[PDB]
Design a protein around this nucleic acid. Structure first.
Lengths: 98, 70, 57, 134, 106
RNA sequence: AAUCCGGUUAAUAUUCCGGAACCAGAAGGUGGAAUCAACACGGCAACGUAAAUGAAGUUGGAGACGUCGGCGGGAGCCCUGGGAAGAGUUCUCUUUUCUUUUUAACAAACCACACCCUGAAAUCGGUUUAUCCGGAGCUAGGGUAUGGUGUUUGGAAGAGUUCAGCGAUGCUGAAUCCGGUGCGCUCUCGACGGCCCUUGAAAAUCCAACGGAAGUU
């Protein structure tokens, strides 16, 4: 919000449409889930300093999730306490990425 | 003249080699107007927080010529 | 003050008012169109002459 | 009753103006999302070019390539024709889920493209594949 | 205060169009304003098209492509109704020709 | 195609000085965007957007078009209530008399006539100052575009003006405010209504369309 109206970074790992993006409320990690079935976990750490550009790096690409009717990960949720990710698939499965 | 509200953007424009000088204006409403002179536009940033103005001041690169109230 | 101007103002207030009772529901579309219709023929020379016309209607 | 699935129709409004489409499914009953006679139509956007034996096989395929489009349009914005085309793989592929889910929409565009290509290779419905001059 | 014209083009004409403004020095000044732009008009019907900014001819080059045309066949040249009329007339004429050829061949 | 403000001369200023912009052309570069599904997606639609190739050939628009009347909008000027400043007048009366009270080009975000969608209407409705339109689809509801303008800034108070002082003409204080308006005058724009008949210059120039040539690196 303090850098520009245009996006600060653009990321296009996903081979399919990106469904949901969730930022962990406390830990400096965020996740993106798409129809490809893979969830991308990125380390986004923010400084309060004006000169300090936030450091965004990938951390993991979570896989082994089913795809049904060209639908993969629909929603992702971050555990309020630790780095645990709740991934909801199209097969009726919920995955605990610990 | 362009009015810029994003402080970071003001930093990036300042780091740009086009920027030549910057002016600090102390208004009666205790606002600091950071007017950065570029090639085509004079980019101004009005900051309401006084300490934000000072913490802004030395975060400006030293090579840039900052100036007192015009 | 020209006679054109007084009618110029009188018609607008008469028309501006006749719309406002219409949207407030005091008069339906049919009687409003009639009320708009006579008012074009200077039927009322002043505002309250028209307001009494709504009450009797 | 003049609008039936598989009937060739013509879009007259919107970006795809004057393009030939086939009625995939009729929703003349209407819906809350589209309170009008909206029917899903799959048509041709980029009409295929004229295949010539002189050009190479790669060139031949590229000219035969057809850009399709799936759209929901109102009935009065469509114009029906006597021509009708029926193809089995385009039965039931379309639904509310497909037009909601972007990947399903992309998948639907893939199949309607593939089925248009095989029909062009088979040399059937040449007039529909032919662009209309106006 | 009485103000004179900035230029020396005496005998003010259509080209000599000015505006009165108050300067930060508290002076009333003549500001010459160029004529207002004209929106493009439809070829078939003639009504100005919808969605095109009304600017000057030389100015139109500065705009991008999407800002000068509408995403439709004959967009930026014909109105939507004119496009609709053009499309249906062409199809009906083609059908009238196809039945006429059918009648002649039988 | 495209410029504004302030200052400056004994005599020149939209030219000079200070500051702030704009237009046109020119190349690469940086970043972003589209493609082995060949040249983007969304909306029922009017159409929208950061981009989103288009040869030959074929068109369209701007330029570019009479006159008159009324209505509406905005700006400046004029009128005027207070606020402030100074100069008055004043035995007394007189919250009083007189004078002043600025924001440019340009750049930002937002702020109302044509059309679309639902709709099928006369028991005729909507409506002008001036009855105009409506199954060739009214009133009503939701939209789309055109933004004449207005709002908030930036420019910009650091400038200008007016008062007080203090010391080369410098330095320091303050204020430069809140309204109300009118058949008002000047200029411009929008929406109509006539009269036309005389149905109302040309070109340079700029834009768009149809058309589909060509085409991991």
């Amino acid at each position: 919000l303090d850098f520009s109206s245009k996006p600060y970074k653009n990321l296009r790992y996903h081979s399919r449409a990106l469904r949901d993006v969730s930022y962990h409320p406390s830990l400096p990690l965020f996740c993106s889930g798409s129809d490809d079935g893979d969830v991308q976990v990125f380390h986004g750490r923010v400084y309060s300093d004006l000169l300090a550009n936030p450091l965004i790096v990938p951390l993991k690409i979570l896989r082994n999730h089913k795809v049904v009717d060209n639908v993969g990960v629909l929603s992702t949720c971050w555990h309020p306490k630790e780095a645990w990710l709740f991934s909801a698939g199209a097969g009726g499965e919920i995955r605990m990425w610990t | 003249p362009r009015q810029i509200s994003d402080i970071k953007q003001f930093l990036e424009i300042a780091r740009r080699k086009d920027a030549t000088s910057a002016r600090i204006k102390k208004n009666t409403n205790k606002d600091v107007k950071f007017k950065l002179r570029c090639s085509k536009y004079l980019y101004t940033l009005v900051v309401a927080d006084a300490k934000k103005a000072e913490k802004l001041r030395q975060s400006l690169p030293p090579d840039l010529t900052v100036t007192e109230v015009g | 003050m020209p006679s054109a101007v007084v009618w110029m103002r009188r018609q607008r207030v008469l028309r501006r008012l006749l719309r406002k009772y219409r949207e407030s529901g005091k008069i339906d579309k049919h009687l409003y169109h009639t009320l708009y219709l006579e008012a074009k023929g200077n039927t009322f020379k002043h505002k309250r002459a028209l307001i009494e016309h709504i009450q009797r209607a | 009753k003049i609008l039936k699935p598989g009937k060739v129709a013509l879009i007259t409004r919107g970006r795809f103006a004057g393009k030939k489409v086939v009625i995939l499914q009729a929703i003349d009953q209407g819906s809350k999302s589209h309170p009008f006679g909206h029917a899903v139509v799959a048509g041709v956007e980029r009409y295929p070019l004229k295949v010539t034996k002189s050009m190479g096989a790669k060139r031949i395929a590229r000219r035969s390539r057809v850009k399709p489009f799936i759209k929901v349009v109102n009935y009065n914005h469509l114009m029906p024709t006597r021509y009708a085309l029926e193809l089995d793989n385009l039965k039931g592929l379309i639904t509310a889920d497909t037009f909601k889910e972007p990947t399903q929409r992309s998948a639907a565009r893939k199949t309607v493209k593939k089925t248009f290509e095989e029909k062009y290779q088979s040399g059937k419905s040449a007039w529909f594949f032919t662009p209309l001059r106006f | 205060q009485r103000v004179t014209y900035r230029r020396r083009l005496a005998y003010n004409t259509r080209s000599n169009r000015t505006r009165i403004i108050k300067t930060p020095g508290n002076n009333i000044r003549y500001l010459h304003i160029k004529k207002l732009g004209t929106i493009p008009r439809c070829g078939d019907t003639g009504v100005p098209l919808q969605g095109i900014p009304a600017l000057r001819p030389r100015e139109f080059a500065r705009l991008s492509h999407n800002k000068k045309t509408v995403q439709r066949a004959y967009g930026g040249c014909l109105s939507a109704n004119a496009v609709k009329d053009r499309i249906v007339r062409a199809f009906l004429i083609e059908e009238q020709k196809i039945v006429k050829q059918k009648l002649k061949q039988l």
